[PDB]
A paper describes a structure:
APOBEC1 (APO1), a member of AID/APOBEC nucleic acid cytosine deaminase family, can edit apolipoprotein B mRNA to regulate cholesterol metabolism. This APO1 RNA editing activity requires a cellular cofactor to achieve tight regulation. Despite the diverse biological function of different APOBEC family members, they all share a highly conserved core deaminase domain (CDD) structure that is composed of a five-β-stranded (β1–β5) sheet adjoined by six helices (h1–h6), with a Zn atom coordinated at the active center.
Finally, the mXT construct was given the catalytically dead mutation E63A to generate an inactive APO1 construct mXTi for crystallization studies. Crystals of MBP–APO1 mXTi were obtained, and its structure was determined to the resolution of 3.5 Å in a space group of P21212 with eight molecules per ASU. The structure of an individual subunit reveals that the N-terminal APO1 deaminase domain (residues 15–187) has the typical core fold of an APOBEC deaminase domain, and its C-terminal domain extension has a novel fold that is unique to APO1. Within an APO1 molecule, the A1HD uses its β-hairpin and h7 and h8 to form hydrophobic interactions with its own CDD, positioning its β-hairpin across the top side of the Zn active center and in close proximity to loops 1 and 7 of the CDD. The other contact interface is much larger, with a buried surface area of 1526.5 Å2 that consists of mostly hydrophobic interactions mediated by the C-terminal A1HD. The A1HD mediates dimerization of APO1 primarily through the pairing of the two β-hairpins via β7 of the two monomers, forming a four-stranded β-sheet connecting the two subunits. The dimeric structure of APO1 reveals a large positively charged surface spanning across the two paired β-hairpins of A1HDs and branching out to the two active centers near the N-termini. The crystallized APO1 mutant had deaminase activity on DNA but not on the APOB-derived RNA that is known to be specifically deaminated by WT APO1.
Author numbering:
A (entry chain B), B (entry chain A): 2 to 371, 1015 to 1236
Write the structure that this text describes.
Amino acid sequence: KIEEGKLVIWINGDKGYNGLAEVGKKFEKDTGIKVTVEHPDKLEEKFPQVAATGDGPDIIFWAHDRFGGYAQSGLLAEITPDKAFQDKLYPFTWDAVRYNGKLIAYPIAVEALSLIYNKDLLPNPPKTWEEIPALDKELKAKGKSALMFNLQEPYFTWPLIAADGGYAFKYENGKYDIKDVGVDNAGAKAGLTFLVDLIKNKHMNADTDYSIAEAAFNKGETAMTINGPWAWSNIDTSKVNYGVTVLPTFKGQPSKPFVGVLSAGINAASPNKELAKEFLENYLLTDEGLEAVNKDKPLGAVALKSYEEELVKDPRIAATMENAQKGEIMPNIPQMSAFWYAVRTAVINAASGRQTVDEALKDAQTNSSSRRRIEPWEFDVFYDPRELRKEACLLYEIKWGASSKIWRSSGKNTTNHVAVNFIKKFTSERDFHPSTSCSITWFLSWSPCWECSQAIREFLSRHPGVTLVIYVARLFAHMDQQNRQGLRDLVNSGVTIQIMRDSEYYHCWRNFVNYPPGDEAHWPQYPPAWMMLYALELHCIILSLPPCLKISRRAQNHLTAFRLHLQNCHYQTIPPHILLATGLIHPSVAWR
Amino acid sequence: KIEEGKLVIWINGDKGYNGLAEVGKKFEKDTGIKVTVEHPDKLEEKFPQVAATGDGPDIIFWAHDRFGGYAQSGLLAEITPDKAFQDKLYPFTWDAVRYNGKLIAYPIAVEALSLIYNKDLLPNPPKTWEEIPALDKELKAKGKSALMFNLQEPYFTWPLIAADGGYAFKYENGKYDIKDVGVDNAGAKAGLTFLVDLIKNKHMNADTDYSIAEAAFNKGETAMTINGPWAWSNIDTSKVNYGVTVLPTFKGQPSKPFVGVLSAGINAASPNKELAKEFLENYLLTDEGLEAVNKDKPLGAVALKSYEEELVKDPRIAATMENAQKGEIMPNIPQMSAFWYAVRTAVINAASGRQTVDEALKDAQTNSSSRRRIEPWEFDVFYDPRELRKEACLLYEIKWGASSKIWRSSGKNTTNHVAVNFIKKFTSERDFHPSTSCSITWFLSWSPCWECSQAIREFLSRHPGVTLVIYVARLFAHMDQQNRQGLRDLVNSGVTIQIMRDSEYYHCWRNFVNYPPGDEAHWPQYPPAWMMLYALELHCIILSLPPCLKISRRAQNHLTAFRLHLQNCHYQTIPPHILLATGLIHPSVAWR
Ligand SMILES: OC[C@H]1O[C@H](O[C@H]2[C@H](O)[C@@H](O)[C@@H](O)O[C@@H]2CO)[C@H](O)[C@@H](O)[C@@H]1O
Ligand SMILES: OC[C@H]1O[C@H](O[C@H]2[C@H](O)[C@@H](O)[C@@H](O)O[C@@H]2CO)[C@H](O)[C@@H](O)[C@@H]1O
Ligand SMILES: OC[C@H]1O[C@H](O[C@H]2[C@H](O)[C@@H](O)[C@@H](O)O[C@@H]2CO)[C@H](O)[C@@H](O)[C@@H]1O
Ligand SMILES: C[As](C)(=O)[O-]
Ligand SMILES: C[As](C)(=O)[O-]
Ligand SMILES: [Zn+2]
Ligand SMILES: [Zn+2]
């Protein structure tokens, strides 16, 4: 767990955890800090749950796709690599680890799927997918199956989908569109139908996973497979004459597999961020340590120019990099998460006889762009009476008096305050519903800033028929004259502002959180201390009164000082029920 | 709540409420302030219940015995009469209305019980109690009663108890001893035994109350009665030729009834202190006002020298004054309440035969200095939001392992920290209770101070076999090196100290508080903020840590400043469950 003077690292079990542990033991021999490497099941999903509470790993190794979402939730800490060390790595890798113009993780290596074929059972690999069935038949009469790969994860099935036009959040103008998804394109459907046909035609088993595929190829039972560099080690120990080459073409077009950038991020809650930076910049990302890691399980094209200079000489590395070039780099935006959850489901339903290709891809098309859901860990990270610097919070519920139906969704911090983002979405999409007489209800943790107050006021004056109500859980810089006037302005302009309470939190839990089936309505009872304190301060703001409480923090959640100063002014003008509700003052005497 | 610009007065229905109302009407005609007089049932007990909430009357008329307790609860306000006016009343009256060197009420008049006899049915009243049965027999042959008086209230039966040495509290120069009680004295036993004999011997009925007694005397059914001046009016309208004289002598000794000083106290919460002072000093305590009150229901000898000087000429007033002289001044200490509540029961149990005279007097003797059933209003005056320095909970429950019986009761401040009071009481009564095993459980308000800690440790060392557990609700001067080291000292000496929580308060409510009959097991749900805060500070104390929170008060319960300073030391050593329970910090920091 995150201990002082200790490093806890999490890396996928398929990679070189022992090699990384050896590098860590060298770090321990030099500085005296135990480096413990762990590989839990589906760490990409366990990491936020434990990092939010605080008991997690000091460093996390994984692709760059989920690092975006992590940094969005404020789980990763910014890395400061001087220009000398920054110039040591290729610019593509750094561009892959940059979120909102800020570096969030150290690039370790590049990984792309490649076609590994048994040179003994097949001297010349096939150049196209259409000839795979015939080949399979010819080898089935001999007692062996060909081209067996993991069908459980969409990362392996995506090359066929993208071969003829599979766009995942089309990119243009330097920005990735979330609404425009391509998993339902003609080419995507064609590729998935071909794979489903390969399964139906008895050429491939839908139950095949990474373990079964790798074991069958290592035992000479299969002539081909699709995998990255990590498998090369076990394949070498299998003494099977194999060859790594490019992936076959689908309908005369090159298969486009996503390019993953294995990177290491530093936990924002770990107090050993200095030790983490030292370990990753001085011992891991060097020819010595990176070579030791590569020794256990190969990691493909590395990010270090010093090592890559003589590592690209391996034809296997060259084939993987060629496949990556033919492919496209994986985006690191947060929505990617949902994207995969959708494709992974579609692929499964396409492998089984539950849904057709069109049905699965259409459901994935409509679910890849989802913002109607929110996880419980991130709910505790944003909607909580306790402070977290990364505001990034908005639960909006729009109701139209005409149809009397609630349309709910969320919003996060995208290089701009969420208020400005919702305003832009409302102004851009004119087809709301009848487009008039709408009641908007916001559930955000931090109070709108002065600039956001002016923007929301201009937006509300722009559209007359908008009944807007705001529920805030925390107060952003409640001791800034401008923020004060902004909140008073919003209230005076017809915007109700109230501090979230038990009712509001439970309502948000039921309507927005992706709570598990069993724990239905089991919302996390938050302490009323800060709820009542922020309510008292907010009422002092509305009454143009001086600040009563003063907070003094120093880190993401470190509270050093807290003071409550109630002047004669407060006792004389602030209503008594609020003071009595905070529980810190006496009732009968507050009234006298 | 208490109204502005209005005077509300509460006086017992047996006094001249109409006369007081007319004086208030004159005050209204002169200053334009409606003075409304009310007479609620059992106001001596209703007044504190409403005064704790703050609502109630502006002025209260009653004996000074209950004013001491009222003042200790912070319910009465200090009066500031000038010397010119103070010299208008008798000095000993002010002495009776003085509590802790401060005048808490305006003395109105003095009242003492007198023997009222029907001059037609009895020409010569009896001079001794021993001849009362004889007289009775004669009148029984006539179809009349000899002596019928209210025996439900101990105020009427006390003269016989004190006739041969019955004292409520011990009398010393400036020192009124609470522990030394004389309700178990030989003379007290003899007096109550004579009363019980009068009841058992068919000379008096044990169910006789004030109503039946007064009505029977006014209807010529009985030849004698015992009453004060207030009954004189109704007796005058009864057309019965009566006479007021001194009380008979028991065993050749004069009957000693407590003398009540009817006084008017000003509610400490009422915002009309000035109006109350004016009404009491300029219109009520004058010859005109006192005469207008005397016309309705006589008040006996008033405290005003101008009126009393020419009022003593009435033989009835002279007889009342003689009974008062031969009697004794009623103490105004708070414990008086319990005292009476004790005697009241004893007497009843002796009249109904449910308990013998010795049993009733012994129980009254043991429960006259304390009270085993605390009222809810005074229990509300004891809690953590109230910073009031005066009241000290001192709820103690002692079990004797030899019998597995629990002894429950309370105690108060009385010019000495409750610690030394309990030490002295236990050291004095050690011989009367069981032999060796003992486990004391304290539920007190303020954490023992430096001096109290040293006294407690020396008491615990003086008695080897004593297991003491302390549950405190607040922390007194938690920023004093001496108090700090004292608490640590008590802990190191084998004494457990913990901050009271919901469970402890519920236990105190169910076992010590006089729970309401209709509302059973409903303990007052109080906010936990200060409970958790004082708990965090207590842990900082025990762990020899620097002060964490700092309070800054300005009035009775006016909290002007409250600061929480959690240094790195605190975060590093304080247990995380306490910090997390306060609700002001994040679990991430607590976990680390
Ligand atoms: O949750 C499944 C996961 O699939 C992909 O993860 C890849 C990973 O990027 C590679 O480094 C390698 O380890 O194979 C994994 C599939 O087993 C996606 O990268 C990821 O977004 C997704 O969550
Ligand atoms: O959520 C992002 C987070 O970044 C920073 O968090 C780190 C930071 O690296 C440190 O300088 C220090 O301030 O606290 C954290 C690690 O101890 C910031 O705290 C803040 O911008 C933000 O919350
Ligand atoms: O403690 C019991 C109760 O007894 C006496 O009360 C008398 C009072 O003195 C009389 O003036 C009359 O008006 O009311 C009571 C008789 O029922 C004590 O004087 C009183 O203080 C005390 O509370
Ligand atoms: C989401 As904000 C920092 O504008 O309140
Ligand atoms: C601190 As104390 C008045 O209970 O001795
Ligand atoms: Zn903003
Ligand atoms: Zn003390």
